[PDB]
Amino acid sequence: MDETGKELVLALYDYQEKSPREVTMKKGDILTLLNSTNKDWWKVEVNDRQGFVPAAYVKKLD
């Protein structure tokens, strides 16, 4: 559980956190998913923090 594909997702383009609900992402960075039930809806963990990120702006398992 430390590779770029299985249980991992690649960033297509950085983001901007202009709110406490939003989240900042970096193109190329790695985002470990904690729970995935929906396609458009994704829930990842960042520094013991939870938020909503653009799943469409990323791809898991290549």
PDB file of N, CA, C and O in Angstrom:
ATOM      1  N   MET A   1       0.828  -1.201   0.000  1.00  0.00           N
ATOM      2  CA  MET A   1       0.000   0.000   0.000  1.00  0.00           C
ATOM      3  C   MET A   1       0.866   1.256   0.000  1.00  0.00           C
ATOM      4  O   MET A   1       0.689   2.143   0.837  1.00  0.00           O
ATOM      5  N   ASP A   2       1.800   1.326  -0.940  1.00  0.00           N
ATOM      6  CA  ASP A   2       2.694   2.474  -1.049  1.00  0.00           C
ATOM      7  C   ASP A   2       3.167   2.660  -2.487  1.00  0.00           C
ATOM      8  O   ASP A   2       4.254   3.184  -2.729  1.00  0.00           O
ATOM      9  N   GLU A   3       2.344   2.226  -3.436  1.00  0.00           N
ATOM     10  CA  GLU A   3       2.682   2.343  -4.850  1.00  0.00           C
ATOM     11  C   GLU A   3       1.744   3.320  -5.554  1.00  0.00           C
ATOM     12  O   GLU A   3       0.765   3.788  -4.972  1.00  0.00           O
ATOM     13  N   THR A   4       2.052   3.627  -6.810  1.00  0.00           N
ATOM     14  CA  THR A   4       1.240   4.549  -7.593  1.00  0.00           C
ATOM     15  C   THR A   4       0.220   3.799  -8.443  1.00  0.00           C
ATOM     16  O   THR A   4       0.388   3.662  -9.654  1.00  0.00           O
ATOM     17  N   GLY A   5      -0.838   3.315  -7.800  1.00  0.00           N
ATOM     18  CA  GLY A   5      -1.869   2.585  -8.513  1.00  0.00           C
ATOM     19  C   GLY A   5      -2.864   1.926  -7.579  1.00  0.00           C
ATOM     20  O   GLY A   5      -4.036   2.300  -7.543  1.00  0.00           O
ATOM     21  N   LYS A   6      -2.397   0.938  -6.822  1.00  0.00           N
ATOM     22  CA  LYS A   6      -3.254   0.224  -5.883  1.00  0.00           C
ATOM     23  C   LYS A   6      -3.414   1.010  -4.585  1.00  0.00           C
ATOM     24  O   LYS A   6      -2.432   1.311  -3.908  1.00  0.00           O
ATOM     25  N   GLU A   7      -4.656   1.336  -4.245  1.00  0.00           N
ATOM     26  CA  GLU A   7      -4.943   2.086  -3.029  1.00  0.00           C
ATOM     27  C   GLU A   7      -4.320   3.478  -3.088  1.00  0.00           C
ATOM     28  O   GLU A   7      -4.186   4.155  -2.067  1.00  0.00           O
ATOM     29  N   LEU A   8      -3.941   3.900  -4.290  1.00  0.00           N
ATOM     30  CA  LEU A   8      -3.331   5.211  -4.484  1.00  0.00           C
ATOM     31  C   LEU A   8      -3.962   5.934  -5.669  1.00  0.00           C
ATOM     32  O   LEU A   8      -4.551   5.308  -6.550  1.00  0.00           O
ATOM     33  N   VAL A   9      -3.833   7.257  -5.685  1.00  0.00           N
ATOM     34  CA  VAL A   9      -4.388   8.066  -6.764  1.00  0.00           C
ATOM     35  C   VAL A   9      -3.412   9.156  -7.192  1.00  0.00           C
ATOM     36  O   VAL A   9      -2.756   9.781  -6.356  1.00  0.00           O
ATOM     37  N   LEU A  10      -3.319   9.380  -8.497  1.00  0.00           N
ATOM     38  CA  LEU A  10      -2.421  10.396  -9.037  1.00  0.00           C
ATOM     39  C   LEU A  10      -3.162  11.710  -9.266  1.00  0.00           C
ATOM     40  O   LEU A  10      -4.342  11.716  -9.614  1.00  0.00           O
ATOM     41  N   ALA A  11      -2.459  12.821  -9.068  1.00  0.00           N
ATOM     42  CA  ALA A  11      -3.048  14.141  -9.256  1.00  0.00           C
ATOM     43  C   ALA A  11      -2.868  14.622 -10.692  1.00  0.00           C
ATOM     44  O   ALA A  11      -1.756  14.624 -11.222  1.00  0.00           O
ATOM     45  N   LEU A  12      -3.968  15.030 -11.316  1.00  0.00           N
ATOM     46  CA  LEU A  12      -3.932  15.513 -12.692  1.00  0.00           C
ATOM     47  C   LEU A  12      -3.581  16.997 -12.739  1.00  0.00           C
ATOM     48  O   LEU A  12      -2.935  17.462 -13.677  1.00  0.00           O
ATOM     49  N   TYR A  13      -4.008  17.733 -11.719  1.00  0.00           N
ATOM     50  CA  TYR A  13      -3.738  19.164 -11.644  1.00  0.00           C
ATOM     51  C   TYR A  13      -3.988  19.691 -10.235  1.00  0.00           C
ATOM     52  O   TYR A  13      -4.999  19.370  -9.610  1.00  0.00           O
ATOM     53  N   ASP A  14      -3.060  20.503  -9.740  1.00  0.00           N
ATOM     54  CA  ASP A  14      -3.179  21.078  -8.406  1.00  0.00           C
ATOM     55  C   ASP A  14      -4.533  21.757  -8.225  1.00  0.00           C
ATOM     56  O   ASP A  14      -5.267  21.968  -9.190  1.00  0.00           O
ATOM     57  N   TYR A  15      -4.857  22.095  -6.982  1.00  0.00           N
ATOM     58  CA  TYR A  15      -6.125  22.746  -6.673  1.00  0.00           C
ATOM     59  C   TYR A  15      -5.909  23.964  -5.779  1.00  0.00           C
ATOM     60  O   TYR A  15      -4.776  24.389  -5.557  1.00  0.00           O
ATOM     61  N   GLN A  16      -7.004  24.517  -5.269  1.00  0.00           N
ATOM     62  CA  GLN A  16      -6.935  25.685  -4.399  1.00  0.00           C
ATOM     63  C   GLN A  16      -7.916  25.557  -3.239  1.00  0.00           C
ATOM     64  O   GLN A  16      -9.102  25.297  -3.443  1.00  0.00           O
ATOM     65  N   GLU A  17      -7.414  25.742  -2.022  1.00  0.00           N
ATOM     66  CA  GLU A  17      -8.248  25.647  -0.829  1.00  0.00           C
ATOM     67  C   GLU A  17      -8.673  27.032  -0.351  1.00  0.00           C
ATOM     68  O   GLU A  17      -8.046  27.617   0.533  1.00  0.00           O
ATOM     69  N   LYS A  18      -9.744  27.552  -0.941  1.00  0.00           N
ATOM     70  CA  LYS A  18     -10.257  28.867  -0.576  1.00  0.00           C
ATOM     71  C   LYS A  18     -11.387  28.749   0.441  1.00  0.00           C
ATOM     72  O   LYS A  18     -12.265  29.609   0.511  1.00  0.00           O
ATOM     73  N   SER A  19     -11.356  27.680   1.229  1.00  0.00           N
ATOM     74  CA  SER A  19     -12.380  27.447   2.242  1.00  0.00           C
ATOM     75  C   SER A  19     -11.997  26.276   3.142  1.00  0.00           C
ATOM     76  O   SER A  19     -11.163  25.440   2.795  1.00  0.00           O
ATOM     77  N   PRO A  20     -12.623  26.213   4.327  1.00  0.00           N
ATOM     78  CA  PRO A  20     -12.365  25.149   5.303  1.00  0.00           C
ATOM     79  C   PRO A  20     -12.899  23.797   4.840  1.00  0.00           C
ATOM     80  O   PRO A  20     -12.484  22.752   5.341  1.00  0.00           O
ATOM     81  N   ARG A  21     -13.817  23.826   3.881  1.00  0.00           N
ATOM     82  CA  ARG A  21     -14.408  22.603   3.351  1.00  0.00           C
ATOM     83  C   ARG A  21     -13.628  22.104   2.138  1.00  0.00           C
ATOM     84  O   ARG A  21     -13.620  20.910   1.841  1.00  0.00           O
ATOM     85  N   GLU A  22     -12.974  23.029   1.441  1.00  0.00           N
ATOM     86  CA  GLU A  22     -12.192  22.682   0.260  1.00  0.00           C
ATOM     87  C   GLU A  22     -10.842  22.090   0.654  1.00  0.00           C
ATOM     88  O   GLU A  22     -10.480  22.070   1.830  1.00  0.00           O
ATOM     89  N   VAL A  23     -10.100  21.610  -0.339  1.00  0.00           N
ATOM     90  CA  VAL A  23      -8.790  21.018  -0.097  1.00  0.00           C
ATOM     91  C   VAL A  23      -7.806  21.392  -1.200  1.00  0.00           C
ATOM     92  O   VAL A  23      -8.179  21.509  -2.368  1.00  0.00           O
ATOM     93  N   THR A  24      -6.544  21.579  -0.822  1.00  0.00           N
ATOM     94  CA  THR A  24      -5.506  21.941  -1.778  1.00  0.00           C
ATOM     95  C   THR A  24      -4.760  20.706  -2.272  1.00  0.00           C
ATOM     96  O   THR A  24      -4.332  19.869  -1.479  1.00  0.00           O
ATOM     97  N   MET A  25      -4.607  20.600  -3.589  1.00  0.00           N
ATOM     98  CA  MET A  25      -3.910  19.469  -4.188  1.00  0.00           C
ATOM     99  C   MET A  25      -2.754  19.943  -5.063  1.00  0.00           C
ATOM    100  O   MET A  25      -2.717  21.098  -5.489  1.00  0.00           O
ATOM    101  N   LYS A  26      -1.812  19.046  -5.328  1.00  0.00           N
ATOM    102  CA  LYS A  26      -0.654  19.371  -6.153  1.00  0.00           C
ATOM    103  C   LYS A  26      -0.461  18.333  -7.253  1.00  0.00           C
ATOM    104  O   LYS A  26      -0.318  17.141  -6.979  1.00  0.00           O
ATOM    105  N   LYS A  27      -0.456  18.792  -8.500  1.00  0.00           N
ATOM    106  CA  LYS A  27      -0.278  17.905  -9.642  1.00  0.00           C
ATOM    107  C   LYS A  27       0.961  17.033  -9.466  1.00  0.00           C
ATOM    108  O   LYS A  27       2.080  17.537  -9.382  1.00  0.00           O
ATOM    109  N   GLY A  28       0.753  15.720  -9.411  1.00  0.00           N
ATOM    110  CA  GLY A  28       1.862  14.799  -9.246  1.00  0.00           C
ATOM    111  C   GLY A  28       1.938  14.229  -7.844  1.00  0.00           C
ATOM    112  O   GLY A  28       2.532  13.172  -7.628  1.00  0.00           O
ATOM    113  N   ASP A  29       1.336  14.928  -6.889  1.00  0.00           N
ATOM    114  CA  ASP A  29       1.338  14.485  -5.500  1.00  0.00           C
ATOM    115  C   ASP A  29       0.541  13.194  -5.340  1.00  0.00           C
ATOM    116  O   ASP A  29      -0.211  12.803  -6.233  1.00  0.00           O
ATOM    117  N   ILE A  30       0.714  12.536  -4.198  1.00  0.00           N
ATOM    118  CA  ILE A  30       0.011  11.289  -3.923  1.00  0.00           C
ATOM    119  C   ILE A  30      -1.044  11.481  -2.838  1.00  0.00           C
ATOM    120  O   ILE A  30      -0.764  12.040  -1.777  1.00  0.00           O
ATOM    121  N   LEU A  31      -2.257  11.013  -3.111  1.00  0.00           N
ATOM    122  CA  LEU A  31      -3.355  11.131  -2.157  1.00  0.00           C
ATOM    123  C   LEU A  31      -3.908   9.758  -1.792  1.00  0.00           C
ATOM    124  O   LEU A  31      -4.519   9.082  -2.620  1.00  0.00           O
ATOM    125  N   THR A  32      -3.693   9.351  -0.544  1.00  0.00           N
ATOM    126  CA  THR A  32      -4.170   8.059  -0.068  1.00  0.00           C
ATOM    127  C   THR A  32      -5.657   8.112   0.265  1.00  0.00           C
ATOM    128  O   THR A  32      -6.088   8.901   1.106  1.00  0.00           O
ATOM    129  N   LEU A  33      -6.437   7.267  -0.400  1.00  0.00           N
ATOM    130  CA  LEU A  33      -7.878   7.216  -0.173  1.00  0.00           C
ATOM    131  C   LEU A  33      -8.207   6.368   1.051  1.00  0.00           C
ATOM    132  O   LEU A  33      -7.631   5.298   1.252  1.00  0.00           O
ATOM    133  N   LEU A  34      -9.138   6.851   1.865  1.00  0.00           N
ATOM    134  CA  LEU A  34      -9.547   6.136   3.070  1.00  0.00           C
ATOM    135  C   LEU A  34     -10.899   5.458   2.868  1.00  0.00           C
ATOM    136  O   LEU A  34     -11.204   4.457   3.515  1.00  0.00           O
ATOM    137  N   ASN A  35     -11.703   6.011   1.966  1.00  0.00           N
ATOM    138  CA  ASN A  35     -13.022   5.458   1.678  1.00  0.00           C
ATOM    139  C   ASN A  35     -13.510   5.903   0.303  1.00  0.00           C
ATOM    140  O   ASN A  35     -13.566   7.098   0.009  1.00  0.00           O
ATOM    141  N   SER A  36     -13.864   4.934  -0.536  1.00  0.00           N
ATOM    142  CA  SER A  36     -14.344   5.227  -1.882  1.00  0.00           C
ATOM    143  C   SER A  36     -15.614   4.439  -2.187  1.00  0.00           C
ATOM    144  O   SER A  36     -15.580   3.218  -2.348  1.00  0.00           O
ATOM    145  N   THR A  37     -16.737   5.147  -2.264  1.00  0.00           N
ATOM    146  CA  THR A  37     -18.020   4.517  -2.549  1.00  0.00           C
ATOM    147  C   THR A  37     -18.635   5.075  -3.828  1.00  0.00           C
ATOM    148  O   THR A  37     -19.339   4.369  -4.548  1.00  0.00           O
ATOM    149  N   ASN A  38     -18.364   6.346  -4.104  1.00  0.00           N
ATOM    150  CA  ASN A  38     -18.891   6.999  -5.297  1.00  0.00           C
ATOM    151  C   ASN A  38     -17.765   7.364  -6.259  1.00  0.00           C
ATOM    152  O   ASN A  38     -16.602   7.454  -5.867  1.00  0.00           O
ATOM    153  N   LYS A  39     -18.120   7.575  -7.522  1.00  0.00           N
ATOM    154  CA  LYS A  39     -17.142   7.933  -8.543  1.00  0.00           C
ATOM    155  C   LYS A  39     -16.844   9.428  -8.511  1.00  0.00           C
ATOM    156  O   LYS A  39     -15.684   9.839  -8.467  1.00  0.00           O
ATOM    157  N   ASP A  40     -17.898  10.237  -8.531  1.00  0.00           N
ATOM    158  CA  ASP A  40     -17.749  11.687  -8.503  1.00  0.00           C
ATOM    159  C   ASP A  40     -17.379  12.167  -7.103  1.00  0.00           C
ATOM    160  O   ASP A  40     -16.778  13.229  -6.939  1.00  0.00           O
ATOM    161  N   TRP A  41     -17.741  11.379  -6.098  1.00  0.00           N
ATOM    162  CA  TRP A  41     -17.448  11.724  -4.712  1.00  0.00           C
ATOM    163  C   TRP A  41     -16.280  10.901  -4.180  1.00  0.00           C
ATOM    164  O   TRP A  41     -16.318   9.670  -4.199  1.00  0.00           O
ATOM    165  N   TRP A  42     -15.245  11.585  -3.708  1.00  0.00           N
ATOM    166  CA  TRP A  42     -14.066  10.914  -3.171  1.00  0.00           C
ATOM    167  C   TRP A  42     -13.685  11.490  -1.812  1.00  0.00           C
ATOM    168  O   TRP A  42     -13.792  12.695  -1.583  1.00  0.00           O
ATOM    169  N   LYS A  43     -13.239  10.621  -0.910  1.00  0.00           N
ATOM    170  CA  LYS A  43     -12.839  11.042   0.427  1.00  0.00           C
ATOM    171  C   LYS A  43     -11.422  10.575   0.744  1.00  0.00           C
ATOM    172  O   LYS A  43     -11.177   9.382   0.920  1.00  0.00           O
ATOM    173  N   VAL A  44     -10.494  11.523   0.819  1.00  0.00           N
ATOM    174  CA  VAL A  44      -9.102  11.208   1.118  1.00  0.00           C
ATOM    175  C   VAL A  44      -8.678  11.808   2.454  1.00  0.00           C
ATOM    176  O   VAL A  44      -9.390  12.628   3.031  1.00  0.00           O
ATOM    177  N   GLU A  45      -7.513  11.391   2.940  1.00  0.00           N
ATOM    178  CA  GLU A  45      -6.994  11.886   4.210  1.00  0.00           C
ATOM    179  C   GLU A  45      -5.706  12.678   3.999  1.00  0.00           C
ATOM    180  O   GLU A  45      -4.798  12.232   3.298  1.00  0.00           O
ATOM    181  N   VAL A  46      -5.636  13.856   4.611  1.00  0.00           N
ATOM    182  CA  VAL A  46      -4.461  14.710   4.491  1.00  0.00           C
ATOM    183  C   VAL A  46      -4.078  15.310   5.840  1.00  0.00           C
ATOM    184  O   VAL A  46      -4.742  16.218   6.338  1.00  0.00           O
ATOM    185  N   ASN A  47      -3.002  14.794   6.427  1.00  0.00           N
ATOM    186  CA  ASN A  47      -2.531  15.278   7.719  1.00  0.00           C
ATOM    187  C   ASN A  47      -3.631  15.181   8.771  1.00  0.00           C
ATOM    188  O   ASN A  47      -3.935  16.155   9.459  1.00  0.00           O
ATOM    189  N   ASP A  48      -4.223  13.998   8.891  1.00  0.00           N
ATOM    190  CA  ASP A  48      -5.288  13.771   9.861  1.00  0.00           C
ATOM    191  C   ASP A  48      -6.472  14.695   9.594  1.00  0.00           C
ATOM    192  O   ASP A  48      -7.206  15.062  10.512  1.00  0.00           O
ATOM    193  N   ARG A  49      -6.653  15.067   8.331  1.00  0.00           N
ATOM    194  CA  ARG A  49      -7.746  15.949   7.942  1.00  0.00           C
ATOM    195  C   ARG A  49      -8.570  15.332   6.817  1.00  0.00           C
ATOM    196  O   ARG A  49      -8.052  14.566   6.005  1.00  0.00           O
ATOM    197  N   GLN A  50      -9.855  15.671   6.776  1.00  0.00           N
ATOM    198  CA  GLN A  50     -10.750  15.148   5.750  1.00  0.00           C
ATOM    199  C   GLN A  50     -11.391  16.283   4.959  1.00  0.00           C
ATOM    200  O   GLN A  50     -11.650  17.359   5.496  1.00  0.00           O
ATOM    201  N   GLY A  51     -11.644  16.034   3.677  1.00  0.00           N
ATOM    202  CA  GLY A  51     -12.252  17.045   2.831  1.00  0.00           C
ATOM    203  C   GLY A  51     -12.726  16.482   1.506  1.00  0.00           C
ATOM    204  O   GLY A  51     -12.597  15.285   1.248  1.00  0.00           O
ATOM    205  N   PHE A  52     -13.278  17.348   0.661  1.00  0.00           N
ATOM    206  CA  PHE A  52     -13.775  16.930  -0.645  1.00  0.00           C
ATOM    207  C   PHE A  52     -12.847  17.406  -1.758  1.00  0.00           C
ATOM    208  O   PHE A  52     -12.630  18.606  -1.931  1.00  0.00           O
ATOM    209  N   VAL A  53     -12.299  16.457  -2.511  1.00  0.00           N
ATOM    210  CA  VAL A  53     -11.394  16.779  -3.608  1.00  0.00           C
ATOM    211  C   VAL A  53     -12.000  16.391  -4.952  1.00  0.00           C
ATOM    212  O   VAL A  53     -12.867  15.521  -5.042  1.00  0.00           O
ATOM    213  N   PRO A  54     -11.535  17.049  -6.024  1.00  0.00           N
ATOM    214  CA  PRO A  54     -12.016  16.790  -7.383  1.00  0.00           C
ATOM    215  C   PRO A  54     -11.572  15.428  -7.906  1.00  0.00           C
ATOM    216  O   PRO A  54     -10.515  15.305  -8.524  1.00  0.00           O
ATOM    217  N   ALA A  55     -12.385  14.408  -7.652  1.00  0.00           N
ATOM    218  CA  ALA A  55     -12.077  13.055  -8.100  1.00  0.00           C
ATOM    219  C   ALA A  55     -11.848  13.014  -9.607  1.00  0.00           C
ATOM    220  O   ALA A  55     -11.057  12.212 -10.103  1.00  0.00           O
ATOM    221  N   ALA A  56     -12.547  13.883 -10.331  1.00  0.00           N
ATOM    222  CA  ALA A  56     -12.420  13.946 -11.782  1.00  0.00           C
ATOM    223  C   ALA A  56     -11.049  14.474 -12.190  1.00  0.00           C
ATOM    224  O   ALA A  56     -10.598  14.256 -13.314  1.00  0.00           O
ATOM    225  N   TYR A  57     -10.391  15.171 -11.269  1.00  0.00           N
ATOM    226  CA  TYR A  57      -9.072  15.734 -11.534  1.00  0.00           C
ATOM    227  C   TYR A  57      -7.971  14.781 -11.078  1.00  0.00           C
ATOM    228  O   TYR A  57      -6.819  15.180 -10.915  1.00  0.00           O
ATOM    229  N   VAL A  58      -8.337  13.519 -10.877  1.00  0.00           N
ATOM    230  CA  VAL A  58      -7.382  12.507 -10.441  1.00  0.00           C
ATOM    231  C   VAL A  58      -7.733  11.139 -11.012  1.00  0.00           C
ATOM    232  O   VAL A  58      -8.801  10.952 -11.595  1.00  0.00           O
ATOM    233  N   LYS A  59      -6.826  10.181 -10.841  1.00  0.00           N
ATOM    234  CA  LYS A  59      -7.040   8.827 -11.337  1.00  0.00           C
ATOM    235  C   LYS A  59      -6.294   7.810 -10.479  1.00  0.00           C
ATOM    236  O   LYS A  59      -5.088   7.929 -10.263  1.00  0.00           O
ATOM    237  N   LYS A  60      -7.018   6.808  -9.994  1.00  0.00           N
ATOM    238  CA  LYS A  60      -6.427   5.767  -9.163  1.00  0.00           C
ATOM    239  C   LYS A  60      -6.238   4.478  -9.956  1.00  0.00           C
ATOM    240  O   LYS A  60      -7.023   4.169 -10.854  1.00  0.00           O
ATOM    241  N   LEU A  61      -5.194   3.728  -9.619  1.00  0.00           N
ATOM    242  CA  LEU A  61      -4.903   2.471 -10.299  1.00  0.00           C
ATOM    243  C   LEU A  61      -4.588   2.710 -11.773  1.00  0.00           C
ATOM    244  O   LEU A  61      -4.829   1.845 -12.617  1.00  0.00           O
ATOM    245  N   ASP A  62      -4.049   3.885 -12.074  1.00  0.00           N
ATOM    246  CA  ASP A  62      -3.698   4.236 -13.446  1.00  0.00           C
ATOM    247  C   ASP A  62      -4.939   4.278 -14.331  1.00  0.00           C
ATOM    248  O   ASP A  62      -5.243   3.285 -14.991  1.00  0.00           O
TER     249      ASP A  62
END
